[PDB]
């Protein structure tokens, strides 16, 4: 309608280790009282090749939703490196942060995440076995990709396809 609108997002604690939590300070406006909570979720894209390697990192229910301008910190566990193809682990991928209301997604914010080793020795000559504790993750927070979707609230009345995951 839209009863809730994203106003701003700050990626906290960035860069970070691959194994550190994700932290976002999210600012949203709510215009009317709602029956239901907001569900915020974060999805890590394991492979640019299929939805088959996505991992839902966490989700958090926010509510009852107060009318006005709201701020909260969303934190989420890192993905399991075990379940990401070894060859795609230390590369660019995307994260998608979305908010749904009663199951209906009304906003998505996508970010590219660059993954690179912390030591010069490993960057040019990476091993076959991946050193997860040595991955530094950088979310490209200056480049958010925001897609809003129109929903009913309470009343009825690689880089090619990474870019595609973002939209």
103: left (phi over 0), alpha (psi -120 to 50) or beta: left
How determined? X-ray
The radius of gyration of the chain from alpha carbons, rounded to an integer in Å, stands at: 17
Q: Which of 51, 73, 70 is nearest to 60 (CA)?
A: 73
Q: Domain residue spans in the chain?
A: 1-167
DSSP label of 4: E
State the distance between the two ends of the chain, measured CA to CA, in whole angstroms. 21
Q: Any residues with CB less than 8 A from the CB of 99 and at least 6 apart, and which? A: 4, 6, 28, 38, 39, 40, 41, 105, 106, 107
**In the chain, which residues are last before a break of more than 2.5 Å from C to the next N?**
157
Q: Which of 147, 139, 161 is nearest to 105 (CA)?
A: 147
**Cβ of 29: how many Cβ atoms within 10 Å?**
14
Instruction: Give every CB contact of residue 32 below 8 A, 6+ residues apart in sequence.
Output: 3, 67, 153, 154
DSSP 133: G
Instruction: Find out whether 136 and 118 touch, Cβ atoms under 8 Å.
Output: yes
N residues, the chain: 167
The CATH code of the domain at 1-167 is: 2.60.40.1490
Instruction: Confirm if 107 and 149 have CB atoms less than 8 A apart.
Output: yes
């Amino acid at each position: 309608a839209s009863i809730v609108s994203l106003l701003g997002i700050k990626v906290l604690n960035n860069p970070a280790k691959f194994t550190d939590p994700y932290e976002f300070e999210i600012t949203f406006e709510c215009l009317e009282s709602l029956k239901h909570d907001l569900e915020w979720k974060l999805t890590y894209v394991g492979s640019s090749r299929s939805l088959d390697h996505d991992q839902e990192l966490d989700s958090i229910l926010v509510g009852p939703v107060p009318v006005g301008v709201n701020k909260f910190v969303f934190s989420a566990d890192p993905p399991s490196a075990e379940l990401i193809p070894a060859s795609e682990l230390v590369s660019v991928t995307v994260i998608l942060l979305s908010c749904s209301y009663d199951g209906r997604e009304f906003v998505r914010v996508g970010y590219y995440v660059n993954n690179e080793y912390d030591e010069e020795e490993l960057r040019e000559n990476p091993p076959a076995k991946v050193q997860v504790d040595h991955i530094v993750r950088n979310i490209l927070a200056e480049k958010p990709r925001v897609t809003r979707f129109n929903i009913v609230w309470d009343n009825a009345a690689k880089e090619i396809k990474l870019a595609r995951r973002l939209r």
